[PDB]
Design a protein around this ligand. Sequence first.
Ligand SMILES: [Cl-]
Ligand SMILES: [Zn+2]
Length: 65
Amino acid sequence: MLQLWSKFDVGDWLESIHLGEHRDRFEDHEIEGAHLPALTKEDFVELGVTRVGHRENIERALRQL
Ligand SMILES: [Cl-]
Ligand SMILES: [Zn+2]
């Protein structure tokens, strides 16, 4: 589950929701499962998620879990 995801799982998760384009950068920033729920709009910008739609997809996917 989320809290137990390593940076690679988060990467796999991004692919599963069609945002694999963002996995390398997330990985370089050492983003792990436990970090996801706390990422702000600014963290996402810094992580390369500059398209509101994609940030919304990430956010929506987090609520599903
Ligand atoms: Cl984007
Ligand atoms: Zn994107």
